Amino acid sequence: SYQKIELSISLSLDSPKLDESDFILLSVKYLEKSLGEFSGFFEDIEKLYFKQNYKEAIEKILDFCKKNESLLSEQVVQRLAEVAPRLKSNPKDNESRRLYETLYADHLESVIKQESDLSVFNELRDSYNAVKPEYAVTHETEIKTLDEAKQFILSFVMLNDNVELPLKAQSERYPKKDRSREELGNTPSANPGIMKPNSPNFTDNLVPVRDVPKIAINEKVAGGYSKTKPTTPFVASLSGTTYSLMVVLTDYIEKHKTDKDIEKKVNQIINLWISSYIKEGYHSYSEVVDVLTEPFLQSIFDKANIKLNYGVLDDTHAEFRKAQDYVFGLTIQSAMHHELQERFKNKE
Amino acid sequence: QKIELSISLSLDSPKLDESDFILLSVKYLEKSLGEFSGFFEDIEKLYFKQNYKEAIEKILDFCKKNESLLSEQVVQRLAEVAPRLKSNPKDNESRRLYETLYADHLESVIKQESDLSVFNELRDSYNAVKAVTHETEIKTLDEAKQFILSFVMLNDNVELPLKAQSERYPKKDRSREELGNTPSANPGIMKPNSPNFTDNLVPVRDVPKIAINEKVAGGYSKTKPTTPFVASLSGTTYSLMVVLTDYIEKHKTDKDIEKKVNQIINLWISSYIKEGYHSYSEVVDVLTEPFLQSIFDKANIKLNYGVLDDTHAEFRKAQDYVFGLTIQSAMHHELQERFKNKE
Amino acid sequence: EEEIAALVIDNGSGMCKAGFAGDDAPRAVFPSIVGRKDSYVGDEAQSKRGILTLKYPIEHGIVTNWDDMEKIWHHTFYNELRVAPEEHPVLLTEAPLNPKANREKMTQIMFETFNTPAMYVAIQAVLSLYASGRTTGIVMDSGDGVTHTVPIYEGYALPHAILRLDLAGRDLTDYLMKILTERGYDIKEKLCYVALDFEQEMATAKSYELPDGQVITIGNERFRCPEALFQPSFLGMESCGIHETTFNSIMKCDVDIRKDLYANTVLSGGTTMYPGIADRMQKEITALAPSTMKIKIIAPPERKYSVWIGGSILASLSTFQQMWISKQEYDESGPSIVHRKCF
Amino acid sequence: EEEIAALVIDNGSGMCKAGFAGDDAPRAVFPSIVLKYPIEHGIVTNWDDMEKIWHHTFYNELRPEEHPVLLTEAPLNPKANREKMTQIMFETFNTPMYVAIQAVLSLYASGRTTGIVMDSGDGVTHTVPIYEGYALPHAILRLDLAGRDLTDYLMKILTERGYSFTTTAEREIVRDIKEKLCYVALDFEQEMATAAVITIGNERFRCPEALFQPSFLGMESCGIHETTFNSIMKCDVDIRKDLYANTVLSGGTTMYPGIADRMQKEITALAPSTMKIKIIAPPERKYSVWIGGSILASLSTFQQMWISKQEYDPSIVHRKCF
């Protein structure tokens, strides 16, 4: 009966690890199903999930719920209304976001895979080799596939703190990373963006047993990023090596501002960096995005008139839905997690 | 409500005779009603007498008067099957059951009495006409009977005068056809087939097949059809009377002769029935003749013809007989139609 | 609604055939083995023959140990049919010439041990004819332990003609062992056939294999195998064959009924499943009989489970309602009601 | 209306256990041979024959259309051996399903949802770590050694003490002895020096020592003692305390008396000198998986973790189930 899918959320909305994110994801399903013209709302709230504006959208959702309380029920609005005021997020336990983002990257890749001319990356080489020649890349005359484009683009770690330092200093934000200097180690795991190794994955979303790092959040750095931006899934820092993409790119912007397609070609790169870095576990959308979105690093784009779409796809639906499903189950099986941690306590 | 319909399912029998109506109908009443002890005892007395036509009247009239305590299925269905009931001396199987059960119940009454000394005296009244070859004094009944079953030694040649006194002995139906031998279950109930309780089954014995010559005018099976078999008009009873009259002549003003002779006659009657030779209604009918009554009138003796007061026991087991006899016929019918509704 | 459904269990010498009423198939057939959980019944035991001493409760068709037979019933009702019997009425099947005890042992069991709501015992050979849709005839039941030739008339058997042979399926298989091992080579009984004239056939004197051992040609032993039934001499039993057992049987009857019998010869059992027994029983019986009579030999194909079919067709009868034994009856008349009601 | 029951089936390598939900008793336990076994070292290999175990299961033993069905699966089952479980039941059997990890079911039986469980059956002995009631892929470890093999071992060992159990019925005798008399010994070596169906043998402590050391058999794998530790150290240092203190023995081959005290010792010495080691053995370990599932099927909330027939309208097995 359907009233077991409704109770299920009445019961999934009562877990002690529910946060701001999971609410938006479960509610929509709840609205999408309690109802069955309201197409825009699941896109308006969606756009906001990719931007981490869970704050306003929770409320708009709970404004639609009341306005359309007619086609919904007293119970859904009651419950939904009780849970919202009491909401916070923890990077460590914000894991639905992580699935979304892990799945989003693979989505931004086909896109880039559908973006044919990969010559854009090849030309970028001539700019790296002039930034750190001592560490010059000397590879395929042509980067033909994104896997080739990706590995090299991930090779900017060769550009040391030395050629990037002029840039890292002026940021006010970078001095505020909160990655502790305690080398906690490596832990083996089943999915990369969802670094949590004990996360309930779907067997479909399972990758090989790769060894992921454990990173700690130094809560005491005054101004920790995690403190200022808690929605961002796991962040102990801000993307340092992004400062390096910029060197290779500052030299490129100025050499190919002459070309008229640079607007496209710069987003092809920035988007790829954003995707591969989220898939491979190195960072989070926002860790990378907040750096390039800096007063000093945006000037370069302004001078040559480039408008960046920092990897923002407006068809993020499949990813949304897939996550709505995550929480659904995660929440039920972790609420009985204590039904049998209470029935058992009735044997002793 | 399950019991009423059953008797309504038993009343469709193609083969129900008269003796079968009484038993089930009383059984219908024994449950529907449940102060009526006077009726049921009076149905047994008539049933023993084979006076069913009078009984049926009483049964059809007992329903009108007490129709209020019954159902309307009972009260119609009897007066619907009663006028079409004809007896058949061949297929009367319930009747035979009743009397085989009384033959065991009347000999026990004489096994309950201790003086089997009447019998010894008779041998001395037997030896005057034609020991009985026996040297063990008559002590038990299994020798008193055997010596009385031995009266068959007094053959036609020594009973024939009395045969020429009867006007009913000429009218006899047994056919001269030698039909042979049947391994029966019981002897009164000779037939190969009769459901028989494990209560009444006994060692396999071979019993004769009897044929009625129905051509005879006025034959016994014809005049009185209630009596089964071919009705056993007993000619061997005439040889008894030879000894009985002679016993009355030698031992005469015996204070206890009327007691002593009823012992001889009943046991004779109950030995002949149990062993299959003849049926009650006919041992009795030979003796009812006026010249055979006379002899007992010459000494002032009144013949208690094997009649017992407490025959409820035997009555009920015939209800359980006809009930199972009738119902199994009904399922049998069903099968026939349904299977012939398969072809 | 949902008047409760009956359960029918043919307790045979070799296997137990159980099912529910108004069905066309036995739900569960399993060996009658109790090996000894405190016991193992059924095919399971057959699997653990190692540490268990298997015993067969029903021997030669009749129940010898009641201690293990109760367990073929818990198993049947409870674990192969998964029904509590308290709820469902239970017919049982019985063998010809069943003593009285066993009929009173059952009643005690299922109304006391199993607290059933209704019971009923019936000769397995009657039910077999009930499948053929006949009420009068001769049924040659041939199980795995005992083969009988029981005459049934108007719904009832004639205990005097029930004839028995201690020759059976177990035996033929066992005899075959001698001969197979006599060719220098579980079994392929599904290739054996009964010849019309064994002697001609032996004057003509096909391919069977499993992975282990070898491909084997079924020898001339194929017809010899069922020829044991016809000539039990192969088993050195002078007991007469099935052709004869049947004729002799027919003649222990009144000569009025026989014609019917010669025309209603049902063959029952799996030992009769051999192809060609049909033409043989005939050729042979015709020889021993009045050429005028009709010899019809009737072998239906549902014969292996014929006993069951008739039983279902019997408990699946509206008119069977009355026949069953209500628990109170037992609670009143004791187990003796078996005879008073199950005739 | 009545609350129709759900059904719980643990399709096993050697034996199948079906019964009915809630019941403290599984109704049926029956060898899976169809003579060919469908399930292999824990993973169904011939599916077609298993469709048959199912007919028997649903019908002949238990007497699907109106009963929901929860088949059990294994850790790290190839997942396409999952969709198919979904497909047969919904389609062939038109069931009105949820597939679960046996191990998860055992811990669940324990009354707890986090620990590491050792499950020795006949096909495979798995050591699975469960946290938050979730099977952990990066730590699941297995051994293709288990009870069936141990029976075989008892055969060889006696084969040389002179008794001979060659036949098929005879093989069952061997299983019978392993099941009971033989035991796990606390100090093998002392006990193979005190050395110096009931025809008696001193191969009572050696048969289950094969679980601890598979060398007898000739297998190059570590004892269940270590498949456990190893698996543990592939778990976050943080959760180890618990796993150590929540170790449950389960499966039928753990019915050998005394595996407990040993599991404690061997691990204890291998373990951090400071952690907390606790082994929890239920006496009902033989059937602990099932019981585990009954509870669940009878949990009010699990009722929506199932899969609707319309929800089915086979890749929902990954996304609505675990």
UniProtKB/TrEMBL annotation, chain C:
InterPro entries: Actin (IPR004000), Actin/actin-like_CS (IPR020902), Actin_CS (IPR004001), ATPase_NBD (IPR043129). Keywords: ATP-binding, Cytoplasm, Cytoskeleton, Nucleotide-binding, Oxidation. It is found in: Cytoplasm, Cytoskeleton. Its main location: cytoplasm. GO terms for biological process: angiogenesis; cellular response to type II interferon; morphogenesis of a polarized epithelium; positive regulation of cell migration; positive regulation of gene expression; positive regulation of wound healing; protein localization to bicellular tight junction; regulation of focal adhesion assembly. GO terms for cellular component: apical junction complex; basal body patch; calyx of Held; extracellular exosome; filamentous actin; myofibril; phagocytic vesicle; Schaffer collateral - CA1 synapse. ATP binds at S13, G14, M15, K17, D144, K188, E189, G270, K304. GO terms for molecular function: ATP binding; identical protein binding; profilin binding; structural constituent of cytoskeleton; ubiquitin protein ligase binding. CDD domains: ASKHA_NBD_actin (cd10224). The keyword GTP-binding does not apply. Pfam families: Actin (PF00022). Belongs to the actin family. This is Actin gamma 1. It comes from Naja naja.
